[PDB]
Write a structure and sequence with these properties.
homodimer, 318 residues, mainly alpha, Annexin V, domain 1, 68% helix, elongated, binds the ligand COc1ccc2c(c1)CN(C(=O)CCN1CCC(Cc3ccccc3)CC1)CCS2, acetylation (chains A, B), Annexin (chains A, B)
C-alpha cells in the first residue's frame, strides 16, 4: 500500500510561458475555456502558483481576478478551487461552511473526520493565520450539543498513538459500543465520544471487529444514511474513515452523484482536495466497491466544460 | 498498513524510582537480572534515557557503564542495544561495520536497503555529526566495484515520487531486467542500478509484475540466495524491501535463527531497532510467510536471560 494521486508535476514547465497561453486565451475576445482548462489541469498546484507569479510580473494583472471575470457557473467554481494553494484549500472550505454556504455539517463532518492528525493540526494553524479567527471557536460558535462536542474531540488531534493493544480494553470498548448501538446512539454520549475520538486507529479497527462477535453486526449497520441527525453521521464517518480514507471518499463521491439534481460542491471538494494526495487510490477503490469507474460516473453525471476538467483531473487508469 | 512497534511508554513513569531499581538491581549484590531485564523492556527508549540521566544526577555513576559491568555475553549486548538512542542506533551499527570491523558488507546491505529516504537522511547527518566523517565517504573507502556504486545511489535518499505510473516505461524496464537476468547479473550493470535505485516504488512493483510474465518466473529466482557475492545480495535485498519492509526483515530474522547456531548479533539489531516502528508488523509477516511464530522461534533457538528479554521485546501475541 502506497498513497497517491492523479496530478503530477509538468516536466518542461515554464511559468512565463503558461502565463502567456492564459493571458492570450482570455485576451479581449470572450474566452478560450478549452485552454484555461487543459493547462491548469495538466499542471500541479505549486506550478499553478508560479504561473500566478509570472502573470503579475509580466502583466500587472492578477490571474485570480482575470479568471474570475471571464468564467462562470460550475466551471468557475472548479477553476477557482484549483488555483487555491493546497495547504490552504481545506481551511478555506471550512470557513465557507462556518460562514455562508448554508447549514453545514456535510463539510465540517467530512473534512474533520477524514483528515489525519498531521492535517487537522495544519488546517487549524492556517485557518487562524489566514482568517484571523480560530477554527475551534468558529466551530463552537456555529454548532450544537453532542455533535459540537465530537467535532471538538476530533479537532484536537490527540489520538493514542500506535503500540501493542490491550485485548482487555478492546473487550470493554466493543461492549460499550454495542450498548450505545442498541440504544440508537441516544444514551451516554459522554462515553462513546472518547472511544471514537481519542482511541487509536488500530485500537478502533480491533474494536470494530470485536463488535461483530458481540452482536453479529457491523457497526455501520447501527446507522442509517438518509434520515439521520448530525451526530450519527459523524459517528459513521469516523467509522468508515478509521477503516479507510480512500474508501470513505470514494463512497462520498458515489452519493454525490446519485439522486435528482446532484452534488457538485462535493464532487469538486473531493476531486480537488485529493488530487495530489490520494486520488488514484480513491479511484481504484471506487472501481472496487461500486463497480462503475469514477470516470464513467462523472461523464454521466456532469456537463460541458466542468465535465471536461473533471475527467482530466481524474485521469483514466483504474 | 498501520505500522506499529511492540514497545510503548509506561504510564506513570517515575524517572528515579526506576533509577533506584537499577541501583539495587545491580549493586551489592553483583547483579539481579530479572528486574533489570523487565524494567528496560517495559520502558520506551527515550525513557531509558531519562533513567540513564536520573541515574547520573542521583548516584554519580554512568548507568550504561554499570549495566555492562555487571552483565555478560548476548544478554549484555541486548541491554546495551536497548539503551542506545533511536536516532543513533543505526548510524552506530553502520559505523561499527565500517570503522575497523573486518569486512562487514552484510550490515551495509541490510540498513541501507531497508531504510526509507527519510531514515537515510537522518542517518547520514546524525552519522556525520557523531563520528566526524560522512556516512558516504566511509562507505566508499571500504567497498569497491558496482556494490559500492549501488550503495552510493541508495545512499542518496532521492528515488522517484509515486505518481502517474507510465505503462510504456514499465515494459522497457522489465525487458531490461529480463536482459540482465539471463546474463546472471554479471554484465550490462549500470542500467539496473538506475532501475533499482531510482525508480518510483509503485513503479518498481509493477516492473516486478511485468517481469515475471516475460520470464516465466519472479526476479528473485534469477538470484541464487546463498551462492552469491555482495552485489547480488544487495540487489536481492532491495527487491525484497520494495515489496514490503516488514517482510524483508522477517526473512532476515528467520535466517538468523534457522539451522545451525544463531546469528545473535543480527537478531539483536532487528529486534531492538524496529521495536518502536514496525516490530508488530514484522511479527505478522513472519507468521504469514513462515508458518511459525517469531516468538516461538526465538524460544526454540535462544537461551537464558537474553531470551526472556527478547520475548518481552517481541511482545505478547499472534
Ligand atoms: C494518529 O494516527 C491517525 C489518527 C487519525 C487518523 C489516521 C491516523 C488515519 N486513518 C487510517 O486509516 C490510517 C492511516 N492512513 C490515513 C491517511 C494517510 C494518507 C494521507 C496522506 C496525506 C494526506 C491525507 C491522507 C495515511 C494512511 C483513519 C483515521 S484519520
Ligand atoms: C521514495 O519513497 C521510498 C523510497 C525507498 C523506500 C521506501 C520509500 C519504503 N518502501 C516502500 O515500499 C514505501 C511504503 N512506505 C513504508 C515505510 C514508510 C511508513 C511511514 C508512514 C508514515 C510515517 C513514517 C513512516 C513510508 C511508506 C520500501 C523500499 S525503501
Amino acid at each position: 500500500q502506497v498513497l497517491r494521486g492523479t496530478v503530477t508535476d509538468f516536466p518542461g514547465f515554464d511559468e512565463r510561458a503558461d502565463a502567456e497561453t492564459l493571458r492570450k486565451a482570455m485576451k479581449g475576445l470572450g474566452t478560450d475555456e478549452e485552454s484555461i482548462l487543459t493547462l491548469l489541469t495538466s499542471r500541479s498546484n505549486a506550478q499553478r502558483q508560479e504561473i500566478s507569479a509570472a502573470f503579475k510580473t509580466l502583466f500587472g494583472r492578477d490571474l485570480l481576478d482575470d479568471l474570475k471575470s471571464e468564467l462562470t457557473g460550475k466551471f468557475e467554481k472548479l477553476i477557482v478551487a484549483l488555483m487555491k494553494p493546497s495547504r490552504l484549500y481545506d481551511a478555506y472550505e471550512l470557513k465557507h461552511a462556518l460562514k455562508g454556504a448554508g447549514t453545514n455539517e456535510k463539510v465540517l463532518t467530512e473534512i474533520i473526520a477524514s483528515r489525519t492528525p498531521e492535517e487537522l493540526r495544519a488546517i487549524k494553524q492556517v485557518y487562524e493565520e489566514e482568517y484571523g479567527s480560530s477554527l475551534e471557536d468558529d466551530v463552537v460558535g456555529d454548532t450544537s450539543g453532542y455533535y459540537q462536542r465530537m467535532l471538538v474531540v476530533l479537532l484536537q488531534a490527540n489520538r493514542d498513538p500506535d503500540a501493542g493493544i490491550d485485548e482487555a480494553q478492546v473487550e470493554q470498548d466493543a461492549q460499550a459500543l454495542f450498548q450505545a448501538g442498541e440504544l440508537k446512539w441516544g444514551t451516554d454520549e459522554e462515553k462513546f465520544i472518547t472511544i471514537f475520538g481519542t482511541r487509536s486507529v488500530s485500537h478502533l479497527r480491533k474494536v470494530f471487529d470485536k463488535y461483530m462477535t458481540i452482536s453479529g453486526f457491523q457497526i455501520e449497520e447501527t446507522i442509517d444514511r438518509e434520515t439521520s441527525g448530525n451526530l450519527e453521521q459523524l459517528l459513521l464517518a469516523v467509522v468508515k474513515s478509521i477503516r479507510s480514507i480512500p474508501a470513505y471518499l470514494a463512497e462520498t463521491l458515489y452519493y454525490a452523484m446519485k439522486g435528482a439534481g446532484t452534488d457538485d460542491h462535493t464532487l469538486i471538494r473531493v476531486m480537488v482536495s485529493r488530487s495530489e494526495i490520494d486520488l488514484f487510490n480513491i479511484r481504484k477503490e471506487f472501481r472496487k466497491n461500486f463497480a462503475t469507474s469514477l470516470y464513467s460516473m462523472i461523464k454521466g453525471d456532469t456537463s460541458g466544460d466542468y465535465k471536461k476538467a473533471l475527467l482530466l483531473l481524474c485521469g483514466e487508469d483504474d
